[model samples]
Target: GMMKTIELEKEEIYCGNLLLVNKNYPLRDNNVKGLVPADIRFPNILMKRDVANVLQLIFEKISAGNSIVPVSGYRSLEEQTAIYDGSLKDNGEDFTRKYVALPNHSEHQTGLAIDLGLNKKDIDFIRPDFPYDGICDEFRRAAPDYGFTQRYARDKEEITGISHEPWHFRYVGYPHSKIMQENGFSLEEYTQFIKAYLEDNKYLFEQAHRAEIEIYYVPAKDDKTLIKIPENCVYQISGNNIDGFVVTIWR
Candidate 1:
């Protein structure tokens, strides 16, 4: 399927699927839309409608007679601040700074990150052990197929600025997650790679099922800009949460 030239305002980058909200790039929008219950037992926890929908399918796909649940998702700026401040109050500055993000810097505020947990007991905090055993082990292996990626993996802490979180999944959607998983790229690294493609004009990848994907970046030149996309193909456009937009064409 082809898409017409879709011009993006620079500010649109601040809110999108591909936007990077981290310790370096703080989020601007706090009033997240499409908020909905995950339909799980976790009361008061919600996620973006699309994310929750996909997560539901993922849980069903990977359940295997075991219980997998959405433990945390879609925190507001105030909520993140409270978590951060409270952590500092209880755990002191060093621990809080290491574990908690400072308000807007948290990806939880973007409504796309979910901290998953097993139904079994003894699981209190996010840890790398979640993916090493039992149902969560199976879920982790199948998660990338459903457009989810472990937000932080071991050895990526230097780039992600967070320790390994085996249960925290970020909803980047489709081939991005697939590509990232295959290439061992973190979101930070993936964004940087996308930016590099701006100069080359395209980065082509052959997917696991033998589908071809062509990705390119376009900087916002004006309030409106013309874009050329392939007709009769699958594609998506997302701003890089910085100065430009990215185009993904699948065939």
Candidate 2:
């Protein structure tokens, strides 16, 4: 027999682990909050409280006794503007556009992204050819388990509009990261897939003989909008950073 359903209001897109900030969808505000310095080797870098919490765990587990450092995190608009302008001046427009994001379009502004450096003979921050041999390789494989994903994956420049950045990671958390990996979808593709489910109003993710997971999207209303889900189930709601919201029900 099937189970009954329940409903919930959508969460604001601006505040979440899954918010998308890119060239097309820029962030309205930095929304930097609850940031603290990470325990990694680099200094003067900070990340959102939750991001830092998980990042510390990630480094501990994946470091493999090597010194992998975090070189950048949680940049303000002003900071990003300066970085972008300086890169443009020093490295030329082509290099800047390929590597550095414009102020508001940067995930660093969300406090949920970080740029890493490997401390070999010479530290390589933002290395495109970062070898898949040591801790760097291990980190990439283990990252999704900690709610992180490579923002600009290899051969995804058409969709991401950025070159492959082996050093950059964004934290979107849980099943979202899992789904993206399982499907080989980039962040752009994943968001669009989630958006498509809205028109149909529901999609189900079934695990072997386990409780099913239901997903659907809803538009916000002038008045308070309501949503329905399964009773006695855990759920989450995230805005799409565009028109409406996505509800994930674990039943």
Candidate 3:
């Protein structure tokens, strides 16, 4: 196998896991803003930027009649921990443990997972008793068509190590996410699935299977540099506030 590397421009870290960024997507709402700006980066464990088409579909479907609002987006490990710790106050240990995952174990740690809810509902608090039916049900069925899935579905709890959460949607891309949805597989299950077909037996860690997309970076010389992006190169561009740029190119 070839040693795969992408020329990450600037000081931008790999957006795979635990990477930080300075801003959110233009359309996304930055609610927690400066108070937790450090948590505003993308995590790994998500679909590539190509999955945006699916997200647009799902977002449209749910927002039409159901009035669902995307309450959370990407989060850094530190921010996830902050949320978990905040939950412990009114939620207590046992309650917080179930809903608020340990930092690394959280699917939100992957940057692709989202927690949506009814527009008028206050879902910020940790209410272990909150029902997962109704609004989320509409989201679950509609998301897979757009390349998203309820990652921690009821049947996938054991492998996922989390109880059923209907509001959480993960973008795993079109075919894979679609298959996972049809087969009722969780994050761990999908991770294992990738391992079976893509892993090298000699390696301890299962490497990421490449999608049909290509990623790249072109360094800028001062603020006046002109980075030539290829035509029709579907990509996600981010600057980690450290003068480095990251771009994930996809079909």
For candidate 1, give the lDDT of residue 220.
74
Candidate 3 lDDT, 41-63, residue by residue in tens: 22332332444345556656766
- Top-TM-score candidate index: 1
Range of the 10 consecutive residues with the lowest summed lDDT in candidate 2: 1-10
Better of 1 and 3 by TM-score: 1
Comparing 1 and 2 on TM-score, the stronger one = 1
Model 1 lDDT tens row, 1-251: 54455556667666668877778888876768989887756657888889888887877887644476666788887788788888788888887776778888888887788887776676665332365688887877777787788888778988888877777889888778888888898999989887778526688877466788888777776576446776777778876666677788887
Task: Residues 1-251, candidate 2: write the lDDT tens digits.
Answer: 34454333433655667677788988865556898887645558998888888888887897555567777888988999998998888889999998888889999998889887666666644453445668887888888877898888878998888988888989987667777888888888887888767626677777688688777767766545666555578877766666566788777
Q: For residue 121, what is the lDDT in candidate 3? A: 42
Q: Which is better, 2 or 3, measured by TM-score?
A: 2
Clashing pairs in 3: 9-245, 10-244, 11-244, 16-44
Give per-residue lDDT, candidate 2, residue 175.
Answer: 64
Q: Could you tell me the TM-score of candidate 2?
A: 0.84
Which pairs of residues collide in model 2? 6-228, 6-229, 7-227, 7-228, 7-229, 8-227
In what order do the candidates fall by TM-score, top score first?
1, 2, 3
